[PDB]
Amino acid sequence: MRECISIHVGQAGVQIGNACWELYCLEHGIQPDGQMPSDKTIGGGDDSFNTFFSETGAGKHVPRAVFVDLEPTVIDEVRTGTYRQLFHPEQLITGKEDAANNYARGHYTIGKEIIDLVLDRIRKLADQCTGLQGFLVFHSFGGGTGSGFTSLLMERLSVDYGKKSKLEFSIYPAPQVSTAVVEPYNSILTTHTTLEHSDCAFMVDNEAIYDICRRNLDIERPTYTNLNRLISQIVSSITASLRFDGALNVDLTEFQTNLVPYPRIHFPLATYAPVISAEKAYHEQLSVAEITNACFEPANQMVKCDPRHGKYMACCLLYRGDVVPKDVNAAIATIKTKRSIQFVDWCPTGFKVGINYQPPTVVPGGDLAKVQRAVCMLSNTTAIAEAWARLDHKFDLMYAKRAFVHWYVGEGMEEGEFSEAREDMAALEKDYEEVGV
Amino acid sequence: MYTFVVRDENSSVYAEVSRLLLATGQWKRLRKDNPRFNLMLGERNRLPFGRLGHEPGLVQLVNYYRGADKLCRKASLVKLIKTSPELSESCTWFPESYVIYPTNLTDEREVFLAAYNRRREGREGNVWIAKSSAILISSEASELLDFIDEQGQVHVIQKYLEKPLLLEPGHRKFDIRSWVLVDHLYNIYLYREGVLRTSSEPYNSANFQDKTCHLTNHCIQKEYSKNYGRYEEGNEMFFEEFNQYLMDALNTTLENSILLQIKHIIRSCLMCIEPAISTKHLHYQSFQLFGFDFMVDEELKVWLIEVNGAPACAQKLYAELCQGIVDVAISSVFPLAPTSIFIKLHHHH
Amino acid sequence: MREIVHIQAGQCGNQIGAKFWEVISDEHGIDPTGSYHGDSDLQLERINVYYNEATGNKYVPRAILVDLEPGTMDSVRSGPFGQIFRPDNFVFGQSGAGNNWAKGHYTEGAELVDSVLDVVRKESESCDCLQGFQLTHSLGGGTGSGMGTLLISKIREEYPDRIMNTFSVMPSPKVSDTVVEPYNATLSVHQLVENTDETYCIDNEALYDICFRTLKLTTPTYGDLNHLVSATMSGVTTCLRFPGQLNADLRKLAVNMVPFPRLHFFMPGFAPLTSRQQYRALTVPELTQQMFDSKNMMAACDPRHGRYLTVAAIFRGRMSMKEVDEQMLNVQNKNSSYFVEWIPNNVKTAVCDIPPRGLKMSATFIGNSTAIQELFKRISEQFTAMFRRKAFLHWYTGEGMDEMEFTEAESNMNDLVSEYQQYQD
Amino acid sequence: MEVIELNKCTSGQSFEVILKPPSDPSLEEIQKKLEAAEERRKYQEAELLKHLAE
Numbered sequence A: 001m002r003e004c005i006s007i008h009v010g011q012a013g014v015q016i017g018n019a020c021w022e023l024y025c026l027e028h029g030i031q032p033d034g035q036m037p038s039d040k041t042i043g044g045g046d047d048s049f050n051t052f053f054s055e056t057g058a059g060k061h062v063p064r065a066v067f068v069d070l071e072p073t074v075i076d077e078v079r080t081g082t083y084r085q086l087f088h089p090e091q092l093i094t095g096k097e098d099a100a101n102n103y104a105r106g107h108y109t110i111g112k113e114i115i116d117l118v119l120d121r122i123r124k125l126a127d128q129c130t131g132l133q134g135f136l137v138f139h140s141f142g143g144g145t146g147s148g149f150t151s152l153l154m155e156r157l158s159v160d161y162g163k164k165s166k167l168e169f170s171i172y173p174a175p176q177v178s179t180a181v182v183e184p185y186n187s188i189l190t191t192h193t194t195l196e197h198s199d200c201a202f203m204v205d206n207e208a209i210y211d212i213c214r215r216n217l218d219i220e221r222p223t224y225t226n227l228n229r230l231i232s233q234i235v236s237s238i239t240a241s242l243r244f245d246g247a248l249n250v251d252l253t254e255f256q257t258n259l260v261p262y263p264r265i266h267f268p269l270a271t272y273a274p275v276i277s278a279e280k281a282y283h284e285q286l287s288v289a290e291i292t293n294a295c296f297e298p299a300n301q302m303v304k305c306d307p308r309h310g311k312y313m314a315c316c317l318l319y320r321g322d323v324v325p326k327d328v329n330a331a332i333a334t335i336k337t338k339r340s341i342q343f344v345d346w347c348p349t350g351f352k353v354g355i356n357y358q359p360p361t362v363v364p365g366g367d368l369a370k371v372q373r374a375v376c377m378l379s380n381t382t383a384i385a386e387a388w389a390r391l392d393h394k395f396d397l398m399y400a401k402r403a404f405v406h407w408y409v410g411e412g413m414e415e416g417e418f419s420e421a422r423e424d425m426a427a428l429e430k431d432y433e434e435v436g437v
Numbered sequence B: 001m002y003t004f005v006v007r008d009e010n011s012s013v014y015a016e017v018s019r020l021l022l023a024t025g026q027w028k029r030l031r032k033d034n035p036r037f038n039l040m041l042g043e044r045n046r047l048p049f050g051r052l053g054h055e056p057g058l059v060q061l062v063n064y065y066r067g068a069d070k071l072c073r074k075a076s077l078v079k080l081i082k083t084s085p086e087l088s089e090s091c092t093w094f095p096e097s098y099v100i101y102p103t104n105l106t107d108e109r110e111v112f113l114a115a116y117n118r119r120r121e122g123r124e125g126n127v128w129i130a131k132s133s134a135i136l137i138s139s140e141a142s143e144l145l146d147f148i149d150e151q152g153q154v155h156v157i158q159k160y161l162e163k164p165l166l167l168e169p170g171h172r173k174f175d176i177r178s179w180v181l182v183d184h185l186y187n188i189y190l191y192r193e194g195v196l197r198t199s200s201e202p203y204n205s206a207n208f209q210d211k212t213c214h215l216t217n218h219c220i221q222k223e224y225s226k227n228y229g230r231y232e233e234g235n236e237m238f239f240e241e242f243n244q245y246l247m248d249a250l251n252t253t254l255e256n257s258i259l260l261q262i263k264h265i266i267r268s269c270l271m272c273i274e275p276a277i278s279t280k281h282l283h284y285q286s287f288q289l290f291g292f293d294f295m296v297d298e299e300l301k302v303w304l305i306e307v308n309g310a311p312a313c314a315q316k317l318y319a320e321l322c323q324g325i326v327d328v329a330i331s332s333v334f335p336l337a338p339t340s341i342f343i344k345l346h347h348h349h
Numbered sequence C: 001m002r003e004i005v006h007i008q009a010g011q012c013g014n015q016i017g018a019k020f021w022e023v024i025s026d027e028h029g030i031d032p033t034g035s036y037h038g039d040s041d042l043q044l045e046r047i048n049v050y051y052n053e054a055t056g057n058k059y060v061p062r063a064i065l066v067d068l069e070p071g072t073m074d075s076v077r078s079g080p081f082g083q084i085f086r087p088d089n090f091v092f093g094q095s096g097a098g099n100n101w102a103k104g105h106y107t108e109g110a111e112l113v114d115s116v117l118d119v120v121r122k123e124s125e126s127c128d129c130l131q132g133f134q135l136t137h138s139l140g141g142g143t144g145s146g147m148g149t150l151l152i153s154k155i156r157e158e159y160p161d162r163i164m165n166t167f168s169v170m171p172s173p174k175v176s177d178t179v180v181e182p183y184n185a186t187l188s189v190h191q192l193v194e195n196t197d198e199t200y201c202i203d204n205e206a207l208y209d210i211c212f213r214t215l216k217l218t219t220p221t222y223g224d225l226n227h228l229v230s231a232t233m234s235g236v237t238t239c240l241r242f243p244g245q246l247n248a249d250l251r252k253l254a255v256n257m258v259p260f261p262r263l264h265f266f267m268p269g270f271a272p273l274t275s276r277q278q279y280r281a282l283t284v285p286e287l288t289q290q291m292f293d294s295k296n297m298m299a300a301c302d303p304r305h306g307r308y309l310t311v312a313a314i315f316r317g318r319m320s321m322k323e324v325d326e327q328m329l330n331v332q333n334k335n336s337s338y339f340v341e342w343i344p345n346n347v348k349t350a351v352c353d354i355p356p357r358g359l360k361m362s363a364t365f366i367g368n369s370t371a372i373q374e375l376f377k378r379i380s381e382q383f384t385a386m387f388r389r390k391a392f393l394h395w396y397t398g399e400g401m402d403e404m405e406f407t408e409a410e411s412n413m414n415d416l417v418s419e420y421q422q423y424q425d
Numbered sequence D: 001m002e003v004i005e006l007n008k009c010t011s012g013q014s015f016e017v018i019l020k021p022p023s024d025p026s027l028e029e030i031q032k033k034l035e036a037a038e039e040r041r042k043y044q045e046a047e048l049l050k051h052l053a054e
């Protein structure tokens, strides 16, 4: 059994981590006090849930998580919330004033003063790992901490944990649920300095989570709790292989091998279905083929884009609930004859399928309804490059006037890092275009 | 108060639509780089579709279907016809065609020669034509291939209709243009008014060197033709006259002899790619005006020539058609505070 | 614990600051003796931002009152909430400033500035994590203008990385005390351009025109003009004083509102502004339409003469946040020609569940608009009309200043106008 | 349409299907960058104090 250390950075990372570990507990039958009755080995064992949970002699199951924020307001809720007993205080790290939505601040000014402290706490969790696989890093693009401190953390992790993998769960900026104007800057700054340090990254566009909440869950104005409970459902489907028995995506190494044939192009598109509102007295339970076919509808993608006008490089189907191999392949045939699924000629036109019999778990009182079967498609489309184009364009409009640049230079960053970062995105877009068109 | 931006100053069509939109007093034009727009009259090449439908509170509409180039490109249309099972390789309304890359660059060179050698041996008319989106008519395959290699872009060789329907008096070739408009709901509307761009030169089958009586383009007739404007004004015969002719000469109607085949071809092409370019469940909506060009032989059979994704309109039909675009395409998604001039081609989505 | 240190200087500064603490004190449930008697924990969630907690659960505003004459501050101490202020935080003199910038910045004020900084330092040392400072003052007088800017220049020396915020009242010939107000304003404006991060420009003409025309006050008084500033101050600080999905500290606001260091002069706005037909329910559209109308803006500038660099709206009260978003995006989508297109989504909206005392809902407007250049244009013209003849200079030269220093201030602001002008095109 | 590498256990199963065949900086360099920006902050603040001293 190999362990995974999860790192939650900034407000977005910490709050999303709150919704994930809440879900990990309901799934694995872990109580708020850390107890797990079903676990028959007290204070140890190399089970599948031990990849994310350590065990004390007293029978407490402690997440392998680290929460970092440059301001203590958000992490302070965790210290007195429902799951205050799961974590011990070392796992929660908080500064005294944030990065003011300023990449340079979180990276250089404040980051330098706390980086060695985080690495120290991370080393403690690592010292409890007999074979650490890698790290799961949750953060936002627009946040000054999410973008600024994360990129510094990644650089260091690659130095102190060379042969280890690092996956990201990144929150892509959306105006509808943001008050910051400088998020394009922060996004392109952190993607530039984090690219060569991240083996695979799952972008979630808040614009997509927002409309899925208003459209499917009939939430007129969703809250972060609403957005986060949905985001963790997808995260649970992605990490389920690492926490349950299985053969597909059993360790973090298998995520690059199965989803990233080219290094720089390591941003899979996630598609999840079904998302049904709990207010519905009862809903027609969708079939394997119906939920599968939905995987190619833009309306359930984590990033609004058109896969029809891209080229796939890989494709994983993760199923949870009442599903058998016979049903999966049947729907696959029906969709290729109806849908436009053009692969790159140097990649096999095939799908890797994973099935877990335990149907999705729903938070009692949450917004999502119980379903008999659900699927999450991880596809590596050139179409996600659309998100880079939208973002790069917003970067160009501002940088052409140097608007807000003084705030960054004033924290010690050089203006040249801007153009050096933007030119890297220009190179990123060209790669996609070369692989797709 | 709706807002729109203009990104193609050369579009004669949408220049009128924009002129009309402003005439309503309810549409407002913005700078071509202002993202807060309800409607975009987008550029032709490299239109950034990926940036549409991401502005909170704005239902955005664009005048181009992403991916429709598969149908409006000479080489793409060929591949789409041969490979698509909806159209199949034996589609009966499209001339036998082949994709021929120049030797300085898959390719159907040998496939064409086999069919050519078969026609040369069977005493059948073996006159082909080569062309590209960026023209040579010849009966010897040697002259067709050597011409393509002299260029540096992809070309297409297809059978040349050697028995084209000739209008009288004159004995002259011609083509027919039909404008088709697809709205956001993917309804296929055919404009009731077509045009015949006629050749003012008598068709001659024993000399493909001079391309003035063979090519019925409005520019070549007005530049390389000596009888331009003799029989009809601007080498353009509209449906009223052409239909009266088909009745006095052939004792039939334009509806039965030609229009049924045109309407059937339009449906076949658009329905074929609907899954690939539909915006039914997309974050933005699309609509686009198309220009189909057909050929009519002496057996009153219609043949598809090419499809234009950015066509112009006959001078006498700019007002009627442009206004029509604003009714079923724009205001259908942005209403304002008949006897349709279109022919709805019902179909299964 | 993100504490703010408040400072109010001179007659205008202390009277306005006085009413400011009177308004928010009621909103947080603090009585005139510093005791809390509110009914919602939201009133105390961020109460330490502006208040210190003394023994016996007493809440003491974190405010330092400054003046060169005892007159105005004596009124505050005898005022309604005068008892609420810390006794030692009163720093004053006897010479006065005679509405003279030189006296407030070089001679009289310089003799007293060191003692005020001693109190500031005392309040800072008790701050767990000090956000920054906020100053209230007028620019056309002598103490708030001349010494106020002296304090800012010295505070930046001792706290170079804390945020400096000011509420600055700009003079107008229509509501004028002395003819030298343009002189003092031009000298202070240069100080603010250098040593503040955000300056809420409050024009006394706009305040006057609002009271007379919109509010239907036959004969306005400085007290009337201060009721507006009070409500406005309570609005712009709602983000700092109450909880919500907005968070927002001074440095975050500065970073998203100020795209360029010197263009940090904001136009504030408040809605509703109702004359006593006052019990009517105001709809979300009515709030929005009013909030953007010029008649509701306190800079005396016509925004339709410039372009918004950034815009921040704060809505207060139980309302349809969905309907708020709808109306806000409607204003942007029906007037996009006035928002610079090179700053995507430069219009942000926050919601707060607690409305001002006696209002079912309200909306505060904060705008970084290039139209503010018209304000500095008025000041520059009135300045040059007198300086070209050197009229009234002896008041200043008699305190040690030279004509050179005036010409520079003159050029410093004309440059400021030109900077606002290039970003409008 | 081929199914390969079927693995079955008590908690589920997984398999692969093929439709068609095909056709860093050291810790020294990081400390320098962090200090380089810290040096540009010190110099910038030095010029402000120099400005204020004047």
Ligand SMILES: Nc1nc2c(ncn2[C@@H]2O[C@H](COP(=O)(O)OP(=O)(O)OP(=O)(O)O)[C@@H](O)[C@H]2O)c(=O)[nH]1
Pocket (backbone or CB within 6 Å): A009, A010, A011, A012, A013, A015, A016, A070, A098, A099, A100, A101, A102, A106, A140, A141, A142, A143, A144, A145, A146, A147, A171, A172, A173, A174, A177, A178, A179, A183, A206, A209, A224, A227, A228, A231
């Ligand atoms: N999905 C989701 N997005 C969030 C959440 N919290 C913040 N965001 C998004 O993150 C972006 C801002 O980043 P933050 O995480 O708040 O910034 P930060 O990491 O705290 O860094 P600071 O600037 O120091 O506060 C905005 O665009 C928000 O929409 C969350 O809980 N869930």
Ligand SMILES: Nc1ncnc2c1ncn2[C@@H]1O[C@H](COP(=O)(O)OP(=O)(O)CP(=O)(O)O)[C@@H](O)[C@H]1O
Pocket (backbone or CB within 6 Å): B095, B129, B131, B158, B159, B160, B161, B162, B173, B174, B175, B214, B215, B216, B217, B293, B295, B305, B306, B308
């Ligand atoms: N296979 C064929 N048989 C007979 N005539 C043909 C033909 N292919 C082309 N033509 C002639 O060529 C003309 C159309 O040329 P084509 O459309 O290929 O070039 P083009 O695209 O630059 C003109 P447009 O786009 O305006 O229709 C028609 O007038 C037709 O008479």
Ligand SMILES: Nc1nc2c(ncn2[C@@H]2O[C@H](COP(=O)(O)OP(=O)(O)O)[C@@H](O)[C@H]2O)c(=O)[nH]1
Pocket (backbone or CB within 6 Å): C009, C010, C011, C012, C013, C015, C016, C097, C098, C099, C138, C139, C140, C141, C142, C143, C144, C145, C169, C170, C171, C172, C175, C176, C177, C181, C204, C207, C222, C223, C225, C226, C229
């Ligand atoms: N809004 C408002 N403005 C004032 C008030 N008192 C003075 N002013 C303005 O402030 C300027 C004079 O400054 P003042 O405060 O009297 O000078 P100081 O006390 O020496 O700093 C003039 O332009 C006045 O119009 C007031 O109570 N309210």
Ligand SMILES: Cc1cc(F)cc(S(N)(=O)=O)c1
Pocket (backbone or CB within 6 Å): A014, A015, A016, A018, A019, A022, A081, A224, A225, A228, A229
């Ligand atoms: C489901 C859940 C649990 C939790 F403890 C905190 C959240 S949050 N921070 O996103 O509001 C969400």
Ligand SMILES: [Ca+2]
Pocket (backbone or CB within 6 Å): A039, A040, A041, A042, A043, A044, A045, A047, A055
């Ligand atoms: Ca165990």
Ligand SMILES: [Ca+2]
Pocket (backbone or CB within 6 Å): A158, A162, A196, A197, A198, D024
């Ligand atoms: Ca690495």
Ligand SMILES: [Ca+2]
Pocket (backbone or CB within 6 Å): C111
């Ligand atoms: Ca003295």
Ligand SMILES: [Mg+2]
Pocket (backbone or CB within 6 Å): A010, A011, A071, A098, A143, A145
């Ligand atoms: Mg934060």
Ligand SMILES: [Mg+2]
Pocket (backbone or CB within 6 Å): B133, B308
């Ligand atoms: Mg053409």
Ligand SMILES: [Mg+2]
Pocket (backbone or CB within 6 Å): C011, C012, C141, C177
């Ligand atoms: Mg006075």
